[model samples]
Target: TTVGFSQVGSESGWRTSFSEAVKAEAKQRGIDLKFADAQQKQENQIKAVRSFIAQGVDAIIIAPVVETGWKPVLKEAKRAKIPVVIVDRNIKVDDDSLFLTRIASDFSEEGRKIGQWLMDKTQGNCDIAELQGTVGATAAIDRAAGFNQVIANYPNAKIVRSQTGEFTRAKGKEVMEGFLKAQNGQPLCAVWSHNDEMALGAVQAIKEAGLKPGKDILIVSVDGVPDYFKAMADGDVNATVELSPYLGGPAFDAIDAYLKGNKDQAKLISTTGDVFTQETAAAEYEKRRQQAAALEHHHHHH
Candidate 1:
């Protein structure tokens, strides 16, 4: 089987891992995969999809950079009768028939879990600074909404300063630095980052500002990356909701089932992950490191 994958650019460690996992899965299944890196541009993604249509690929997959601007291209794909599976992040469309299925994590649940953890830690009376993801991205929008929903019950808890970190560690650090300076000596009880990369950046910013990250200011985020687990073990970050990068298995399963003439598939497939705290950070970090090393070895043999 042949497939075309239009991936968002490698903006973070998790993003890169996702792309690699997809490729690895394709290879394992003996599927010929045409990969296109959209470089974080919707136009590029649209062009890639159009090209996939031109190539008459068996199926197409996309991890959209943003939620909007997908309708027209998706319509074209539908016209061509090529099934497109959305992975990682969602795309917005009025018509549900544009894609076969969306396979991704429940981003809102991740946010809500982390928020509840923070509330329990702080006793529901904490000031927070939020580091959001890329603007208009589904992960950013939905995660923020979910976290806000949980925090709204606590009258004393609120997000004091919120800004987009673009899901990059550098941008996360920069935005956090600005938030630290702008607070003007006010105590920030915690930081709620949309992803672990930003939370890791906030840890650096906190240290540079002469404040202990996990002690003076609690840190919580989604996407339990290895570095973030290490940070948590080092007493820098408090908690993180895991964002699994293994969506490739579910995506391929959906596409394979569809191709086998069993088309009664659900529109959205949810992949849920657990929230990890400092208590289990050390063990989780060790396990992740070993897995990463094994994966690295596997890749080297390819």
Candidate 2:
């Protein structure tokens, strides 16, 4: 069985890492990964889905652009009897039966983890600023939901400023700078971000304003990228959550089992990730850096 994948572009380092990871794993597993880059456009993603369907692939995987607009195309895949596996992002389609299974990280839990860590560290009181990704995406919604969950526990730890960064480094920097300016030296207790790139951007903005990130304003975020680990090692970032995009290996393994009539349908949700801080960052820094750097080099070369 062949697998067709439509990915979001190299919009950020995180997405880029995800793209290459899928490619590498697909090759190792001997699955012909019919892949496309949506270039961060919904229309392009729709076209890619249609093309994959036309190619008569046994399975199709989508990392959707927005969310709801994919109902029609997903219906077509359903009719074609093609198994679909949505990774990272999901669609708003009611018929999840159209897909075989979904592989993803628990985004909502990620948000809560960071939020709780911050609240506990602060002893329950401080001004916080937030940086969100694409406005209505699952990552943003789940993360925000989890963040609010933790914040609700601490009455005094309130979020004073927040804005969407659209998951881009440039936007993350701009939005965070706005948050810093709004407080005007009022002192921010924490900076909550949707992803590491945004957190790194916020770190830049914080440094520009002459404040220490981890010491003065504790930084915690999702997507435990290498840069975030570096910051943790430098004692600049308090913590971050790991997000592994190594699902291609499992996807093909499932496909092989299914084709041989060896198993029933099921979803494989990976339970791999790390909650890293200064203590572990130093020891694990090289281990993490090697993966991140390999991804960085592969994406640029390709």
Candidate 3:
């Protein structure tokens, strides 16, 4: 019973890198990773889970697209005696124990980190507009909650507007522009976003409106894409939270132990790295960019 599993869709760069890293780790550990990418669609991921069940993999891993709709297929895994491991998201099921373990970032902690940075950066006094990721997403929910926890300490600063950016560059930009219009050019102190893509998108709108971002309006976001840190150093953004795609090593080890008939252990692995403002982002940005680029090139060539 060699352990096998599937991955959620590769919608964002974060998702893509995470998927690749886990696959490689699984290979290195001699665990078979029967991965099915859902391309960010829950329906496709659902089908992939069912497919894995039919294929009779010893175990299943899912970086679920959202927080619900997993009960039906998870039950199948239960019946088949295959354990399910969740990476980076939650599933709303009757039995929480159905998922053997999770390898994930504490999105709340991530939010608190960046949120605290912004609060300190601004000294806890400013008006913020938020660009939330797709509704009901764990990343969105947990990150937002964590941010609120920090902002609560800063009574002077409040998030005046919050809305979904759908985790897309285009839509994020568009929504920001709309937020700007709603504000009618009133000075905005910052834009907080669930991910770097939306943060960048919000920046595009800020620039188009003839305003300087990270100067007039501070920027704080999650998901430390190297480009985002580059912007931070360049003063286009203030801070970003890192969501490492590199946590796959543990998942591979879990799979190995399970296939060996030892399920005594489980993991809630977290890989975290952060990027800060101009005073700190440059060196870290270059290092991470190099590491990520090298990984990509290595994967492509082989």
User: Considering every candidate listed, which one attains the maximal TM-score?
Assistant: 1
Stretches off by above 4 angstroms in model 2 are 267-272, 299-302
Candidate 3 pairs with clashing backbones = 9-39
Name the lDDT value of residue 26 in candidate 3.
Answer: 74
lDDT of 2 by residue, 1-302 (tens): 58889887777777877888888988887788888998888888889899999999988888876777888888899888777777887677776676677777888888888787787778889788888888767889888998899899888989888899888888888998898888877988898889888888888888998998889998888888778788899988888888887766666666666667774777645553656778899887889888777755552433
| TM-score of every model versus the real structure | 0.96, 0.94, 0.92
Worst 10 residues of 3 by lDDT: 293-302
Highest lDDT: give the candidate number.
Answer: 1
Scored by lDDT, model 1 comes in at: 0.91
Better of 2 and 3 by lDDT: 2
Query: What is candidate 1's lDDT per residue for 1-302, written digit by digit as tens?
Result: 88999998878888877878888889999989998888889899999999999999999999999988999999999999899999989988999999999999898898898999999999999999999999999999999999999999999899999999999999999999999999999999999999988888999999999999999999999988888888988999999998888887888888899999995999999977998999998888999997666555654321
Q: Candidate 2: TM-score?
A: 0.94
The residue-by-residue lDDT of candidate 3 on 1-302, one tens digit each, is: 35555566655666767777776777777776777777668888888888888888877778887898888888888888888888787777777767777888889998899888888888988899999988878999999999999899988999998999988888889999999999986899999999988899899999999999989988888887777887887888888877877666666667667767785874465666664567878788778788678656763421
- In model 2, which residue pairs have backbone atoms overlapping below 3 Å? none
Backbone clashes in each candidate structure, one number apiece?
A: 0, 0, 1
Tell me how candidate 2 scores on lDDT. 0.82
The alpha-carbon deviation from the true structure for residue 77 of candidate 2, after best TM-score superposition, in angstroms, is: 1.2
Between prediction 1 and prediction 2, which has the larger TM-score? 1
